Write a protein that binds this ligand. Structure first.
Ligand code: HEM
Ligand code: HEM
Ligand code: HEM
Ligand code: HEM
Lengths: 141, 146, 141, 146
């Protein structure tokens, strides 16, 4: 639901993200649990302390799932329908915490790419993460 | 209750340790760009359409400095939030009638521009603390409805 | 997105609502402005006091628009696309206040039909009003 | 700030003027039915699937009376909310980790069942006042995260 111009902008900035996808997902879950502590019920078996390796692993997994959503940019509910099923039915996750994690990921993306994080690409990526949360709330089982 | 005294001191210390000038005006420009329907409240500012004219707007950078000074007062006198946020809360409730998730949007975009302006000077404890202080600011600024 | 059973239940309960649609919309806007005063910016020219006639009129209009959404029950975004256009572009209304007014309307519906407001029809009508807010947030211009 | 003393008196007076028995248990049943994924927190109660077994559940009606007594304490000692909501707030934050819009759902479904149980004894001032007191209850019960 984007322009080809800002679609080109987000795929270029996401290439600049690149092989730091696992690192950025790790820090996104780090800031997620440190900031919105209501969410730690969904990861109880982890060690909810400073810098956990399985937190980094699951952050890598979630970040690359978002890279798959990047690679299927206009086909986002089609790409994320299985995860929508998993989250709304298996794990039974409240559907605005996706918006919570989306803004937290924008905070870590702006923290790590400040020489590229223009308000233009900021607005584009915010609309994108709004869309990812939007297609995870349409609980198509 | 509220935070540790050491972390509230970290809040006021690192907010003093920002580059104190244009972070509010850039946060205003970022809020109005990434959410383009908040400027229904800000139609009276004139320059609100393009980001370049937004950064060039004396009204935008003046409102940024005004919010910045209000944050300076609300974090210096952090003990009595609801005493400091009195005339602003009256304005935002009675005259402006701002919908209370717009303060959520502004607090979160300020968190984004502070992350942008620090990078390595932004510990995620400092992020969670700042999220708490802007939630307290947004509550003290939206309480005369209630 | 409902069963034929609870669809039959909501059309029967909505027939029990009936010609009190204008009255219920009037009291829904009454409780709306008295409860969530952030919303009175969207109706400035009205007299924001006890029992205003134009408030009752617009409540009648909004309630019958919801009756049209009832009459187009499975075609709800198709029915409400023009209003989605109006609200997200013309009036520029924040999209969760539809959920606010939806729950306020459920409060006045339970207040006025307590000998019919079973938790079953309550859950059905809550899913319905969730759907009305859902199709007004998909800002299809 | 908070309401008028006369309207806070109206809050505690009309909450004393409810049929004091099963409004909490019916609100619990209504919450769990109209939102069926809140019982992820309540899986330990056993009877949580069908509404009839929900109303027959001693755990459901006991939790309804427990919430009812907690509301009775929080509205009798309405001046110090955060002193009364201490062990409950600690439980809900640390042990339970309840997502803070579930308190929004519970407060609003309690407002719905009080509207159902009154009808003509439910002035929309009393509704707005009750919305405020359950927002204050939900804030005092979700503050140890912060
Ligand atoms: C915003 C976009 C999100 C994406 C793309 C995403 C992606 C994923 C993926 C791919 C998995 C599967 C991991 C596996 O194979 O075990 C997963 C699992 C999970 N997700 Fe997320 N997720 C998102 C948001 C969230 C949020 C906000 C939460 C809130 C707590 C959450 C909670 C979970 C949980 C609890 C699991 C199960 C983890 C496990 O059992 O190991 N997800 N997610
Ligand atoms: C979150 C912290 C906020 C603070 C500290 C703050 C502070 C202020 C200040 C200092 C003024 C100037 C008052 C004057 O010059 O007389 C003002 C006015 C105003 N504020 Fe904000 N505000 C905040 C949030 C918001 C939000 C979220 C909006 C949403 C659109 C908003 C909309 C306005 C408007 C429309 C005005 C009138 C413009 C003017 O008076 O020049 N404020 N506020
Ligand atoms: C939940 C379902 C809603 C429906 C079905 C609905 C329906 C309508 C309709 C049919 C109109 C056209 C009235 C006319 O012809 O002038 C209208 C106008 C309007 N609606 Fe609603 N509405 C809903 C929710 C809301 C909410 C929550 C607000 C929040 C304040 C809102 C704000 C407005 C405004 C400001 C107007 C313009 C009124 C005027 O200019 O006279 N609507 N709505
Ligand atoms: C809004 C006001 C609320 C009040 C006054 C309240 C009060 C209580 C009380 C009195 C107990 C019993 C503690 C005990 O017996 O040791 C309890 C436990 C519990 N509460 Fe609530 N609660 C509220 C909201 C919620 C919400 C929204 C949820 C969401 C699911 C929730 C979930 C639980 C759970 C799972 C338990 C444990 C069950 C048990 O201990 O028997 N509470 N709460």
């Amino acid at each position: 639901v984007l322009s080809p111009a800002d679609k080109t902008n987000v795929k270029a900035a996401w290439g600049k993200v690149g092989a730091h996808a696992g690192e950025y997902g790790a820090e996104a879950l780090e800031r997620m649990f440190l900031s919105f502590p209501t969410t730690k019920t969904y990861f109880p078996h982890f060690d909810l302390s400073h810098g956990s390796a399985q937190v980094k692993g699951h952050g890598k997994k979630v970040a690359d799932a978002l890279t798959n959503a990047v690679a299927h940019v206009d086909d986002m509910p089609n790409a994320l329908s299985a995860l929508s099923d998993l989250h709304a039915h298996k794990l039974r996750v409240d559907p605005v915490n996706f918006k919570l994690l989306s803004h937290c990921l924008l905070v870590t993306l702006a923290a790590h790419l400040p020489a590229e994080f223009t308000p233009a690409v900021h607005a584009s990526l915010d609309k994108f993460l709004a869309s990812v949360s939007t297609v995870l709330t349409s609980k198509y089982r | 209750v509220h935070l540790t005294p050491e972390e509230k001191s970290a809040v006021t210390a690192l907010w003093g340790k920002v580059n104190v000038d244009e972070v509010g005006g850039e946060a205003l420009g970022r809020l109005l760009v990434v959410y383009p329907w908040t400027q229904r409240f800000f139609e009276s500012f004139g320059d609100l359409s393009t980001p370049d004219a937004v950064m060039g707007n004396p009204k935008v950078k003046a409102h940024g400095k005004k919010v910045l000074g209000a944050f300076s007062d609300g974090l210096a006198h952090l003990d009595n939030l609801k005493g400091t946020f009195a005339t602003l809360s009256e304005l935002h409730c009675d005259k402006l009638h701002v919908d209370p998730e717009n303060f959520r949007l502004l607090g979160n975009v300020l968190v984004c521009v502070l992350a942008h302006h620090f990078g390595k000077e932004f510990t995620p404890p400092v992020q969670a603390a700042y999220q708490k202080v802007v939630a307290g600011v947004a509550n003290a600024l939206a309480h005369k409805y209630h």
